């Protein structure tokens, strides 16, 4: 069999062949009530399905040797796992092209036997060709691309940020369990820094890559199949990537809010509300490419340190070598761009915080009073529905004389608070003057009910803390 015939005799789905089948969901409860120390956490849970189709694949800085312009790879199940099967055979010369500024021009060069070694040489030689014409200026700005996402699933954040889950896991330390138990609220940003790209001139036919001596039965033996179709690395982004982790123990609906407020440094990042969230928040910044040394990290409570990390890696130097961040590939058959089809189901967890309170009753009046304190306690059934539990203060409908002071403590799941004080000038409770009559009292920390005055001129005030 021929090479150009062989490669065409391949019946594979150009779409489904490079596809990640991100895990199918674990059974969730739509709503969950959870008491966790002076706090009642209400978590709502929704199943979400995301379908991404990136044409850009990231490279694990460990196996960077297998990815370069003109490289030959396989569209096998190992490709989606960012560790591809290489294809080293005898090659016909292939042309590469740098996209560095102010180059019309000589930006293009010919490589005789495309191998990582001489291809790196050709990229280096092309860079020499730029930094000789621009002998004076060595520092250029990086072409920064910014991504930002809330973390729910290991599978989701990987599908969200087109970054290998393990990379993200190891380099940042995403506690995916705390995240899955709504014990931690995690946001990860990704400042993708591109120095330049090296493009490798596409062939007219599959044969234009392979030296004539090479046959389809050698490639067939080398792993080429309908299951592992051949690929060519058409483009490679060279540079670094700063990843930033924003961690909090809070369940306050305004985390994403305080986090965005903080990254953008918008005036609101100063208000009291966002302040308690920053008190339980750690910021981690890691850089991955070439320049910063392996296992570098910033772990801070002051976002200004992180801010420094980004402004520092926003400029690259033309004399220092660049390392491959991501890459485009093409199927040898249609010369069409190979894309990864990312299916992923995940649970989108939303949460709210509630902190306990207490009604403080204070009778001081020149009369007898009677109280009618009552509220509900919210619980959630297995189907997610709200279940009300009617509670009443034990001292309800019993005579109180000046001076009487008490506390009616309320559990953070308390709703429907009613405080009522009636005045004993009358036959029985049913027909007594209200001194205070309050409905749907908002659960504070302190609900201060004070009844004072005279049996004819009584006073009442409902104050909060």
Swiss-Prot record:
Site entry (Important for cholesterol binding), positions: 424
Membrane topology: Multi-pass membrane protein
Swiss-Prot/TrEMBL GO biological process terms: hemolysis in another organism; symbiont-mediated cytolysis of host cell
InterPro entries: Thiol_cytolys_C (IPR035390), Thiol_cytolys_C_sf (IPR038700), Thiol_cytolysin (IPR001869), Thiol_cytolysin_ab_sf (IPR036363), Thiol_cytolysin_sf (IPR036359)
Compartmental location: Secreted; Host cell membrane
The entry's keywords: Cytolysis, Hemolysis, Host cell membrane, Host membrane, Lipid-binding, Membrane, Secreted, Signal, Toxin, Transmembrane, Transmembrane beta strand, Virulence
Sequence motif Conserved undecapeptide, location on chain: 423-433
MF annotations from Gene Ontology: cholesterol binding; toxin activity
Keyword set includes Transmembrane helix: no
Coarse class of the protein's main subcellular location: secreted
Protein origin, superkingdom: Bacteria
GO cellular component: extracellular region; host cell plasma membrane; membrane
Transmembrane segments: 154-167, 174-183, 252-261, 269-281
Motif (Cholesterol binding): 455-456
Membership in a protein family: Belongs to the cholesterol-dependent cytolysin family.
Domain text: Mature protein has 3 discontinuous domains; D1, D2, D3 followed by C-terminal D4; the domains rearrange substantially upon membrane insertion. A highly conserved undecapeptide in the D4 domain has residues important for membrane binding and cell lysis, and penetrates into the upper leaflet of cholesterol-rich bilayers in the pre-pore complex.
Reported function: A cholesterol-dependent toxin that causes cytolysis by forming pores in cholesterol-containing host membranes. After binding to target membranes, the protein assembles into a pre-pore complex. A major conformational change leads to insertion in the host membrane and formation of an oligomeric pore complex. Cholesterol is required for binding to host cell membranes, membrane insertion and pore formation; cholesterol binding is mediated by a Thr-Leu pair in the C-terminus. Can be reversibly inactivated by oxidation.
Subunit structure: Modeling based on cryo-EM shows a homooligomeric pore complex containing 38-44 subunits; when inserted in the host membrane.
Protein name per the record: Perfringolysin O
Gene name as annotated: pfo
């Amino acid at each position: 069999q021929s090479i150009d015939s062989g490669i065409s005799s391949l019946s594979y789905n150009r779409n489904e062949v490079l596809a990640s089948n991100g895990d199918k969901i674990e059974s969730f409860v739509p709503k969950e009530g959870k008491k966790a120390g002076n706090k009642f956490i209400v978590v709502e849970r929704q199943k979400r399905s995301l379908t991404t189709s990136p044409v850009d694949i990231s490279i694990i800085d460990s196996v960077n040797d297998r990815t370069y312009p003109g490289a030959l790879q396989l569209a096998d199940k190992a490709f989606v796992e960012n560790r591809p099967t290489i294809l080293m055979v005898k090659r016909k010369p292939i042309n590469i092209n740098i996209d560095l500024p102010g180059l019309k021009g000589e930006n293009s060069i010919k490589v005789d036997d495309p191998t990582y070694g001489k291809v790196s040489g050709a990229i280096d030689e092309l860079v020499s060709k730029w930094n000789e014409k621009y002998s004076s200026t060595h520092t250029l700005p990086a072409r920064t691309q910014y991504s930002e996402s809330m973390v729910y699933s290991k599978s989701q954040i990987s599908s969200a940020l087109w970054v290998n889950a393990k990379v993200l896991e190891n380099s940042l330390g995403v506690d995916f369990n705390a995240v899955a138990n709504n014990e931690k609220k995690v946001m990860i940003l990704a400042y993708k820094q591109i120095f330049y790209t090296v493009s490798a001139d596409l062939p007219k036919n599959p044969s234009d890559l392979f030296d004539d001596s090479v046959t389809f039965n050698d490639l067939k033996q080398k792993g080429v199949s309908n299951e592992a179709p051949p690929l060519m690395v058409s483009n490679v982004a060279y540079g670094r990537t700063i990843y930033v982790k924003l961690e909090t123990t809070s369940s306050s609906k305004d985390v994403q809010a305080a986090f965005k407020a903080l990254i953008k440094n918008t005036d609101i990042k100063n208000s009291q509300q966002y302040k308690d969230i920053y008190e339980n928040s750690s910021f981690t910044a890691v850089v991955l490419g070439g320049d910063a040394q392996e296992h570098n990290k910033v772990v801070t409570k002051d976002f200004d340190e992180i801010r420094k990390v980004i402004k520092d890696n926003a400029t690259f130097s033309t004399k220092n070598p660049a390392y491959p961040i991501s890459y485009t590939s093409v199927f040898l058959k249609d010369n069409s761009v190979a894309a990864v089809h990312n299916k992923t189901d995940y649970i989108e967890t939303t949460s709210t915080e509630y902190s306990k309170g207490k009604i403080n009753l204070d009778h001081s009046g020149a009369y007898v009073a009677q109280f009618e304190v009552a509220w509900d306690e919210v619980s959630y059934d297995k189907e997610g529905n709200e279940v009300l539990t009617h509670k009443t203060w034990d001292g309800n409908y019993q005579d109180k004389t000046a001076h009487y002071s008490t506390v009616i403590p309320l559990e953070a799941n308390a709703r429907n608070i009613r405080i009522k004080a009636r005045e004993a000038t009358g036959l029985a409770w049913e027909w007594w003057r209200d001194v205070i009559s309050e409905y749907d009292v908002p659960l504070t920390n302190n609900i201060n009910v004070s009844i004072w005055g005279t049996t004819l001129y009584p006073g009442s005030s409902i104050t909060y803390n």
